[PDB]
């Protein structure tokens, strides 16, 4: 159940550069998901020690959570919006491939993913 080090959230040697899409991902997508009543399991990395999940990080090879994504967006870690979208997708995929369907945590992920996909439908165009 040992936990990996937390993912990196800052890149000390990349330029500070926004795009309209990255602004949208932070100020619309992340903001909306973060305040949802079902966000709390996803606001920090899975703690396999405290949740007693010895197999979690043997099955989940790319851990991801919204706290990491939030910090990455705030620190301008991503070079483009697609890297951020992939992190969201990884977070949901991890939940769905580890947990049993109908588990409460899967229902929570499904509700958050619906909101995520609706907001991504309105992602502004590259510019
Ligand atoms: C920072 C606080 O974190 C928690 C507190 C409590 N508590 C608070 C108080 C109550 O009275 C007692 C339970 C329960 C869970 C979490 N966290 C948490 N993080 C990640 C996961 C998750 N739960 N669930 C539920 C999972 C369960 C099994 C296998 C995988 C997962 C999973 O995929 N995710 C995303």
From Swiss-Prot:
Subcellular location: Nucleus; Chromosome
Domain of life: Eukaryota
Residues with site note (Acetylated histone binding): 99
Tissue and organ expression note: Ubiquitously expressed.
Bromo domain mapped to chain residues: 17-123
Cross-linked residues, Glycyl lysine isopeptide (Lys-Gly) (interchain with G-Cter in SUMO2): 58
Modification after translation: Phosphorylation by CK2 disrupt the intramolecular binding between the bromo domain 2 and the NPS region and promotes binding between the NPS and the BID regions, leading to activate the protein and promote binding to acetylated histones. In absence of phosphorylation, BRD4 does not localize to p53/TP53 target gene promoters, phosphorylation promoting recruitment to p53/TP53 target promoters.
Additional facts recorded: JQ1, a thieno-triazolo-1,4-diazepine derivative, and I-BET, a benzodiazepine derivative, have been tested on tumors with success. Treatment with GSK1210151A (I-BET151, a I-BET derivative) has strong effets on mixed lineage leukemia and promotes myeloid differentiation and leukemia stem-cell depletion.
Subunit record text: Interacts with p53/TP53; the interaction is direct. Interacts (via CTD region) with CDK9 and CCNT1, acting as an associated component of P-TEFb complex. Interacts with RELA (when acetylated at 'Lys-310'). Interacts (via NET domain) with NSD3, CHD4, BICRA and ATAD5. The interaction with BICRA bridges BRD4 to the GBAF complex. Interacts (via NET domain) with JMJD6 (via JmjC and N-terminal domains); the interaction is stronger in presence of ssRNA and recruits JMJD6 on distal enhancers. Interacts with NSD3. Interacts with NIPBL. (Microbial infection) Interacts with bovine papillomavirus type 1 regulatory protein E2. This interactions may serve for the tethering of viral genomes to host mitotic chromosomes allowing successful partitioning of the viral genome during cell division.
Domain commentary: The NET domain mediates interaction with a number of chromatin proteins involved in transcription regulation (NSD3, JMJD6, CHD4, GLTSCR1 and ATAD5).
Disease link: Cornelia de Lange syndrome 6: A form of Cornelia de Lange syndrome, a clinically heterogeneous developmental disorder associated with malformations affecting multiple systems. It is characterized by facial dysmorphisms, abnormal hands and feet, growth delay, cognitive retardation, hirsutism, gastroesophageal dysfunction and cardiac, ophthalmologic and genitourinary anomalies. CDLS6 inheritance is autosomal dominant. A chromosomal aberration involving BRD4 is found in a rare, aggressive, and lethal carcinoma arising in midline organs of young people. Translocation t(15;19)(q14;p13) with NUTM1 which produces a BRD4-NUTM1 fusion protein.
UniProt family annotation: Belongs to the BET family.
Function recorded in the entry: Chromatin reader protein that recognizes and binds acetylated histones and plays a key role in transmission of epigenetic memory across cell divisions and transcription regulation. Remains associated with acetylated chromatin throughout the entire cell cycle and provides epigenetic memory for postmitotic G1 gene transcription by preserving acetylated chromatin status and maintaining high-order chromatin structure. During interphase, plays a key role in regulating the transcription of signal-inducible genes by associating with the P-TEFb complex and recruiting it to promoters.
Name of the protein: Bromodomain-containing protein 4
Higher taxonomy: Eukaryota, Metazoa, Chordata, Craniata, Vertebrata
Name of the gene this protein is made from: BRD4
